[PDB]
Every structure is written in C-alpha cells, then in structure tokens.
Design a protein around this ligand. Structure first.
Ligand code: NA
Length: 724
C-alpha cells in the first residue's frame, strides 16, 4: 500500500563508497556509506544543494498541508507575547544591566539602571531604566545575536561578540558605556561602536587587563565542515587595529586543542587553559602579569600536571587564588593556590561532596562563599565562610528548580533568578547578614493565559534494564487522568555531565494543556544529576546504558498508566539526537513520533568534522579497534533496522543547511538512509531545514515559534491527537 504523501524525493547513492575500520573482535570491518557525498557542505556541492532544496520542499508541503500547523503557530504567538527579563547584573560603571524582551522581539535587549534606582525598572509602565544594546538593530531579519559581553574594569568600555550573518563565527566589537543604542536607530547597522573589530573568533572568552587598555581573546586562522584547527590566544589594545594584536599562545603541534586565558578578578594573575577533548581536564599554566610584558615571552609556571583536572578561578587574595577544581574530586571542590609557593600545590578550602556535584562557587559581601550544588537533579545554594570554609547554612531551601546568581565580592546583595518546569522566572534579592540574611521577591515573570496552578511536576524513580534506580520529572495538568490514555512528550540528552534540570518552557506546558499530555524528563545516565559517576556510567562502552534508561522510562510510563502505548513522542538535540535515533532503531515499536534537533548520528565519522574530534572522550575513538566494536553496536546511522520486520515511527529532523556545532551531514545521511530503507513509510521521515542558519545560541523568537509549530503539529498528526 503506497501512502498519498509519497514518494520521497530521490537521493543519489554511491554504491562503491566504503571505509575499512580496525576491529578488536573481527580484525577489520568494511562499512559502506552510500550517502558519503552529503558530507560535502551545501555551499560546495550542487548534489548537497539539490538534496537540501528537494528535502526542504517535501517536508514543508507535508507540514503546511496540516491545518493544525497554523493553529499551533497562532496559539504559540499569542501565549509567547509575555515580558521576560534576567536578574539585575551589577557592573563597574555603577549600573545594573538586565536582559528584557517585551514579548515577540527577535532577540533580548540589554537595559541598565543606576544602582539605587532599581525599584523603578520592570513595572507595568515597561522595562524602565535606559536601553543600552538592542541586538534587533544588528540584522534586517533579527537573526544576528550578541554572543557575549564584558565591561572594562574602569566601566568606560564594553567588549561584545556578534555572530556573523552566515555562520557560528563572530567578531568582537568595543563601544563606550556612554554610547548606548538609541530606541529610534534603524536596523541593519551597529551605530555608536568604536573602530575596533576582532575577526576570526569562534567562542567569546574575553578578559580585560586591570588597566582597561586591552583584553585577551581566542581566535583561529582566517576562514578562507573541516575540523576546527589552530586556536590562538591574542591580546588586543583598544584603539589599535587587529593586525597590531600581540600573539600570546599557539601550539601548531596540536591543532585540534582549544585554548583560552582567564584573569583573577584583581587582574594580577593569568590562567592559561588548553582542552584536547570534551573531558573536564586541562593543561594549565599561571603567570603574574606584574612580572611580564604581554607576549610569547611570559614566565609561565605549572599550576598542576596536565590532563588530570579542570581549574576555574573563583577569586583572589593577593598571591592566593581560589579555584573550583575536580583535582582528585570528580564532583568538584574549592581549593586555594599560593602563587608565591607553587610547589606547595592546592590546599582544600571546601572538600568534595561525594553525593553532590558542585556547579559554581562565587564570593559575595567580602567573605561569603556561595556554592551551587546539583543534588536530586535540582540546585541547592550553600553559604560558607571564605576564610575558614565553615558552613553558614542554606538559602532558598524551599525552592526546587535551578538558580542563576548575580552579584560581586564588593556587593552585600545578590539577585537570584529562580525557575522550574512550573516557575517561569522569579528574581529574588538576598541581603547577607551576620548570622542570617533576608530574602525579598524583586520581580516575577507572569504569563497571561497560563494558570500555573493547573499543573504539577511529579518526582518518580524507575528501575532501568540493569536494575539502576533512575529519577524522572513528570509535568502534567492536575486534571489529566492516569488511565493509560494520555500522550507523552519525553525529552532526553544523556551525556557530557549535562543535567536535565527543572527548566521553564511555555511551549511544553501548552503541549500538555492542548493535548491533555504529560512532559517526561528522565534523568538518564550520562548527565551529572547524581554526580560525575552518573556521567561515567553513561559514556564510552556504557553509552548503551543511556538508551536503556530512556527506553525503560517509556515502558514505566505505559506500565503505570501515565501514557498510552500508542502516543509516545520522544525528543532530543545534538548528543540527544544520538539518543532519539538509537532508541528509534532499538525499540521502534515503543515510539509513535521521534523529534531529532541537530542530531549527532554517524558515530564513526563524527571526529572528521568541526568540533567532533573533542567528542572522542565521550563516545570513544572510532579509529581505535576496541572502541570501534562498542560504537558500531549502537551507531544509529549503521543500525537502521531491516525493512522486512520493522515499522519505523514517524520521524522529523530539524537542522540548518550550515551548522558548526553539529555538521548537518549527520541528519542529511540518516534521512537519506531511512527514506531508502523505508520508501513506503507507512510513517513519514522528514527533514525540516532552516536556510538562514538561525543559530543555536542566537535563534529569533519568530523562528523558534515556527519550528515549535512544525514540531507540535507533526507530533499531533503522527499520534492522532486533536487540539482541545
Ligand atoms: Na538581530
């Protein structure tokens, strides 16, 4: 039987294309890749162009034929038109800065208010204060993004990154803090900036010297799919051209290594850190900027033996530097180094918590050390004495979710942004005291037409295949019955010590309301939810544990009558695309709809493209014979089930035509192979393409809504759901 939506657009095959891999078990294994031509970028291949255009047109026709697509876009537009803001961030110009969106602006704007006048911002009258920077003015389409910013210590200068209009490359710009954007400036330019333009940057790590004369940054050779190579550290002096910038570090022997510098808050010490993979291990060196001219002739001293640990600067006290480090402490700890006694090594200030991952450490009110711990898949705030490390107790103990803390060592107050599945964003002020402090509600995000009291988030524990107890969040309307009829949207990642925290998404709650559905977040292995050991149990030869955890979550939801066996939708992005494609291959019968965002799918070829080589610490090295065998077992691109005795779920793949973070070739080849293997469906396999590269880290509000309307209408069609 031939479905009315077919046939699929044709995709050229290369029947001769193969690579031979060393294998511990088999000696050698020859892997055919009939779609290897789709590894050539869109801009360089007419074949890749023809594939993208035909697949894009085919997907759009199917998605747009569904009237629920426009119904979802209208519902999303109306509900997403709510005011959003960050916590107040104190800066060296004596102003608080905050992110603001009226509702449907493409990008967040940056506003400011004099410290002491903050009670006049974020009222019914509007954001108040003064507009500082409006990213919406940068591009005609609103796809140009602020990638970061750092104010000069003097408070006169503001260094900031803007993503270039084709790519995930950026330029660093500088403007005076006396040159804000004006509300009536025209789109397509950046008015009021200084002449400085730092090109060839792929990540924003900028550190000003204490004299405010310049900043350190990391850059690459000029850009005229290939692995990212030859990261260099430079120093830029304000008012000079980039051509005058002084080279601080290059390592031509190790072109895949990523390098950056961080300065202590005093600006006295510079920490050089190199990374050779995605693991939390560095090659680290410290220099005293008072001993050295900026250049390649600086007196670098070894902080510790290379590749054993990561070191993040938390503060300084003369020659004493405070570090958050995992040195002999996989869950991280706080330790001090005396730059005057390097050979004495690191002294523990806050011991590793064996049962809690330390996320951050920051100094406040001169000598209060604030620790954010991850315990039971949510944030805890602990206060410690900076001098002794002695515990001073807990704050916000009653709030279960995630926190963003803003405030400096010199401020007695912090602003804390609290959020969860059910809390869109409450900014609390906390004022430090002698024995206890005082907490005040500053401002709360409210969403018109959403009643947060209509929803709940349950915490359950389920056994995985191997008997391991896994935590899962289940968000649902309180009035949805547990009678085994509800649809599920189940989101997972599983990797890189990244926790799936309670996180606010209006879209997800609208999915729950409109489809009487549950939103399930199983805290599967690979994440840091139960400490670094939770990551170690879900990587390399144990990556299969991640898929088993996710499958067992679905089986538990069905068995305990949370969900209909026929209405499971799964969702994942990047490393989460390994999860969605692997689970679809290994248990196609569990799932009715699979959403993959910028998926990693070819687990043999991933090292050959942009930043993929760094993922070898997580997945293994496919060119190592031992690693090949365990990677090849699950590599979703190489394990599409034979068509004869499998019905594939409906599958929708989101990707840009250009993406540095995950090369779109992963999606291109897997979509080609799925369509070839299952040419008659019965369930469609579609690729939803953005041609504007709408950056992950810089996506306009309107693009996000269109993508969500495509995703939800496709899930609705695929699982036979009616919008309520
Ligand atoms: Na823009």
């Amino acid at each position: 039987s031939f479905p009315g939506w077919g046939p699929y657009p044709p995709v050229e095959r290369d029947e001769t294309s193969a690579i031979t891999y060393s294998s511990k078990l088999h000696g050698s294994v020859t892997v055919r890749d009939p779609y290897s031509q789709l590894e050539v970028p869109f801009e360089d291949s007419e074949e890749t162009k023809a594939f993208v255009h035909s697949q894009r047109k085919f997907a759009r026709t199917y998605l747009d034929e569904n009237p629920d697509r426009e119904a979802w876009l209208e519902t999303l537009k109306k509900s997403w038109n709510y005011r959003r803001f960050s916590a107040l961030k104190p800066e060296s110009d004596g102003h608080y800065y905050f992110e603001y969106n009226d509702g449907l602006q493409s990008q967040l704007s940056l506003y400011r208010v004099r410290m002491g006048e903050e009670d006049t911002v974020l009222t019914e009258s509007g954001p108040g204060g003064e507009l500082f920077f409006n990213p919406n003015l940068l591009s005609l389409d609103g796809n140009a993004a602020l990638t970061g910013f750092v104010m000069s210590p003097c408070g006169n200068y503001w260094a900031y990154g803007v993503s270039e209009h084709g790519s995930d490359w950026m330029s660093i710009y500088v403007r005076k803090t006396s040159s804000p954007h004006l509300p009536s400036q025209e789109r397509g330019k950046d008015p009021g900036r200084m002449n400085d333009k730092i090109r060839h940057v792929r990540f924003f790590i900028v550190s000003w010297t204490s004299d405010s004369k310049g900043f350190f940054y990391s850059r690459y050779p000029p850009e005229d799919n290939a692995p990212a190579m030859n990261c260099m550290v430079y120093y830029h002096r304000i008012g000079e051209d980039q051509e005058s910038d002084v080279l601080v570090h290059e390592d031509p022997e190790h072109p895949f290594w990523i390098s950056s510098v961080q300065l202590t808050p005093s600006g006295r010490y510079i920490l050089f850190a190199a990374s050779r993979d995605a693991s939390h291990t560095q090659l680290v060196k410290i220099a005293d900027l008072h001993e050295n001219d900026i250049g390649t002739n600086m007196k670098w001293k070894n902080l510790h033996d290379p590749w054993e640990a990561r070191f993040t600067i938390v503060g300084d006290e003369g020659s004493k530097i405070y570090f958050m480090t995992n040195l002999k402490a996989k869950n991280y700890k706080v330790a001090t180094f005396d730059a005057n006694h390097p050979d004495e090594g690191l002294t523990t200030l806050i011991a590793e918590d064996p049962n809690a991952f330390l996320v951050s450490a920051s100094i406040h009110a001169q000598d209060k050390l604030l620790l954010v711990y991850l315990r039971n898949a949510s944030h805890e705030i602990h206060i410690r004495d900076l001098t002794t490390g002695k515990p001073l107790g807990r704050i916000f103990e009653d709030l279960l979710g995630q926190f963003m803390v803003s405030g400096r060592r010199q401020d007695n107050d912090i602003f804390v942004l609290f959020s969860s599945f059910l809390s869109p964003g409450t900014v609390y002020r906390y004022t430090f005291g002698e024995e206890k402090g005082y907490r005040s509600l500053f401002r709360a995000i409210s969403i018109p037409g959403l009643n947060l009291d209509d929803f709940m988030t349950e915490s359950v524990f389920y056994p995985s295949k191997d008997g391991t107890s896994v935590h899962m969040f289940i968000t649902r309307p309180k009035d949805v019955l547990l009678d085994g009829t509800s649809p599920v949207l189940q989101y997972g990642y599983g990797g890189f010590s990244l926790a799936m925290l309670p996180t606010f998404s209006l879209s997800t709650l609208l999915f729950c309301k409109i489809y009487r559905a549950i939103y399930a977040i199983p805290n599967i292995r690979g994440g840091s939810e139960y400490g670094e050991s939770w990551h170690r149990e879900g990587m390399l030869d144990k990556k299969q544990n991640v898929f088993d955890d996710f499958n067992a979550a679905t089986e538990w939801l069905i068995a305990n009558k949370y969900a209909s066996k026929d209405r499971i939708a799964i969702r994942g992005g990047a490393n989460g695309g390994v999860l969605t494609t692997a689970c679809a291959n290994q248990a196609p019968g569990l799932y009715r709809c699979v959403i993959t965002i910028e998926g990693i799918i070819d687990m043999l070829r991933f090292p050959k493209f942009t930043f993929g080589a760094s993922w070898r610490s997580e997945y293994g090295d496919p060119e190592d014979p031992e690693d090949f065998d365990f990677i090849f077992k699950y590599s979703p691109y190489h394990n599409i089930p034979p068509p004869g005795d499998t019905v594939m779920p409906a599958m929708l793949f989101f990707t840009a035509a250009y993406d540095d973070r995950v090369s779109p070739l992963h999606t291109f080849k897997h979509v080609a192979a799925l369509q070839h293997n299952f040419p008659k469906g019965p369930n469609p396999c579609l690729m939803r393409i953005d041609l504007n590269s709408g950056h992950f880290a810089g996506k306009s509000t309107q693009e996000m809504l269109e993508e969500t309307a495509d995703e939800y209408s496709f899930i609705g069609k695929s699982m036979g759901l009616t919008m309520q």
